């Protein structure tokens, strides 16, 4: 008798709703970018299925005396039932002796339900502590504020729209108990933004964290190298990076690593900073398949991924400048080597030096050898039509986007391409494709075919394998097309920045 959404089952509203209900549902989406109305129907003690593999219950054995953790949850104008459901999932599914304090860090909310109402509600839970930021500061500063209030040996960071699952905590703390330089993440499961349905997979499908050369986090499957280290896919696996929202760390080790770079602005990337310094300054980073936490997955694209201005640049530049050695150049190519103002980084350099950290080359060689380095490609940079000043140009959404041509601007971004050994014209994981209609950009599949191109050096033509046609610019200079190949047609002549035959 768990009510709507019990055992993580979906809650669906009726097709027909009164106008007052419709206003309530729409209001919920406006405020939260998820369906707050259905969350409000679902118990804040909503039961969930046990998502763990049999290995996690029958074969995994954890140290008897685990260190206590504080759980730090930062929020800004979170919905009442969603914030409460997070906190109760922590209280109800974690052994009491393993929780120090649940520290709720209010990053300057203005909604009334988060003020006195929130204090009164948790007054009867002595483990819950509310910290009020004095101005709006963003996630990094709120998390550091939380860490400074924390007294337990381990910090566990969650966000405000999570649901812990059965047995989530012990596997994380066991790794830190064995070696306090180990940083750990639960497997992050999907809670639907529409129905709040909870979804879990077995440990066979575990993904691990990487990054692309735009310095954005990305997921990849456990590489074969790492799978060969384990007898069961349920064992914790090394991860080059963490997504950042959910992890545990020894409190002193976090401070030793310099927590987060407080010179970052609010637009993220501190997950990558912490990942890099964990591996190259004496620690390890694991994803722990026996530990699941559900997380409300908003399908709506957040502002930072579609901004008209590059809000990601400052933190990416500070990251590259402090931690990436000579490899920073590949990110700088992506932004046209226009680094902007990234502030003062000298204290972070002193931090890295004082910790005697390893090189970024060591990190790439040893932790993330699967990452392809753009300098090893046949060509990288702009792809320019010789007789004029038009460049191959595309908005890269990870969907099929149209590929066109625009005046070369020398700023990277939409005009940055790589020519791979396999004949792909690509940016990150999207490949130039032609199937007889329009030239498009979609996910690289590694099968050549319609994604196979050759640069014909003596004519400077971009020749397409399966069609036998050549990439060209219309004589009105405003449309990209595929046409019959012809030597001497200047409209079919392209130059590829950094083209190097020796690389194929
Ligand atoms: C803990 O892990 C770090 C990083 O792998 C390693 O340098 C250290 O020797 C380990 N400590 C113990 C006691 O195994």
Residue numbers in the entry: 143 to 540, 542 to 647
Publication text:
PGANT9B crystallizes with 2 molecules per asymmetric unit, but density for UDP, Mn2+, or a peptide is not present in the active site under these crystallization conditions. The active site residue Asp 301 is misaligned, and the active site loop is disordered. Another charged region is evident in the electrostatic potential map, where residues including Asp 535 and Glu 550 form a distinct negatively charged patch on the surface of the lectin domain. Thus, both enzymes have two distinct charged patches in their lectin domain formed by the α-subunit that results in preferences to recruit either negatively (PGANT9A) or positively (PGANT9B) charged substrates to the active site for catalysis.
Interestingly, we found two distinct Drosophila cDNA clones emanating from the CG30463 gene, differing only in a ~30 amino acid region (the α subunit) of the lectin domain. Comparison of these clones to genomic sequence data revealed that they represent splice variants of exon 8. This splicing event generates an α subunit with a net positive charge (isoform A, containing exon 8A) or a net negative charge (isoform B, containing exon 8B).
